[PDB]
Amino acid sequence: NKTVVVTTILESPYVMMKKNHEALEGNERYEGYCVDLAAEIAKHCGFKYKLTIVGDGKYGARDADTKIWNGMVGELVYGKADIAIAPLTITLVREEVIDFSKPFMSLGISIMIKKGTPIESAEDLSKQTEIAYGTLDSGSTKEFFRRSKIAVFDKMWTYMRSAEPSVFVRTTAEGVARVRKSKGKYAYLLESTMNEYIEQRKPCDTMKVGGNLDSKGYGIATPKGSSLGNAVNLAVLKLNEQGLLDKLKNKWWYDKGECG
């Protein structure tokens, strides 16, 4: 009937501007895991779509005062977009206002260190102060620590929320740059699949250490009651069962890995 508005976010390798995007237009301007996923979802659900980058560049959180939802979640809640296809974490608070398909990717919070840093776990981080550590300034990773009642994670949150200077960063790129330029005095807490991706990128000076702190997944989101919800959910299950999601990860993570 009508072209579906897809909201997504510039997060490598999910969505990236093609080198020669200027010579291109529309959906052809972008490339990445979620760009490929969107094409597959649309084909299996039978709809035409337009890729758009979330206006405020955020994932989705609710302001405690205004009660307004920002980010991709907000665009769905307010009808500015019809579906969100990005590394958007399935969480309780979001599930209450929008619908999520079954997960297309499984992950967990993990630790990124510059090679050589004497840290092997969250426990290690929480028991020392020489090495600073933080998370993305907004998102499920930060919220995980803020709301955690688990001893170690609660101790980590207490340190992070009051640390000076700030240990929180605006983007993944900033967190990675901080790890790489801090001579081992900064460790970054981020979602495991991103940690895995960066570990295979030059200058190959970072690595994931320890096990994941939690377990969760990314899901495709639609406004509550959307007529696209059901088909999208089944499409995700079909793509996973056919092994296409596994193929996409290899395509964007390892096939072109730069660290051997």
Ligand X SMILES: N[C@@H](Cn1cc(Br)c(=O)[nH]c1=O)C(=O)O
Q: Which residues are annotated as a binding site?
A: 87, 89, 94, 140-141, 191
Q: Which of residues 5-64 bind a second copy (CB under 8 A)?
A: none
Q: How many CB atoms are located within 10 Å of the residue 153 CB? A: 20
Amino acid at 105: M
Q: Which of residues 4-63 bind ligand X (CB under 6 A)?
A: 59
59 binds, among ligand X, a second copy, none (CB under 5 to 8 A by kind): ligand X
Angle at 194 between CA 189 and CA 196, to 5 degrees: 100
How many Cα atoms within 13 Å fall on the side-chain side of residue 11? Answer: 25
Bind-site residues for L-glutamate: 87, 89, 94, 140-141, 191
Instruction: Spell out, one character per residue from 69 to 98, where the chain touches ligand X: x when CB under 6 A holds, - when not.
Output: ------------------xxx---------
88 binds, among a second copy, ligand X, none (CB under 5 to 8 A by kind): ligand X
DSSP state of 245: H
CA pair distance 187, 110, nearest whole angstrom:
10
DSSP state of 26: G
For a second copy, the binding residue among 128, 158, 166, 215 (CB under 8 A) is 215
CB closer to a second copy, 77 vs 176: 77
Q: β-pairing, 16-17 with 30-31? A: antiparallel
User: Are 148 and 94 within 8 A, CB to CB?
Assistant: no
Instruction: Spell out, one character per residue from 95 to 134, where the chain touches a second copy: x when CB under 8 A holds, - when not.
Output: xx---x-xx--x----------------------------
Q: Which of residues 226-245 bind a second copy (CB under 8 A)?
A: 233-234, 237-238, 240-243, 245
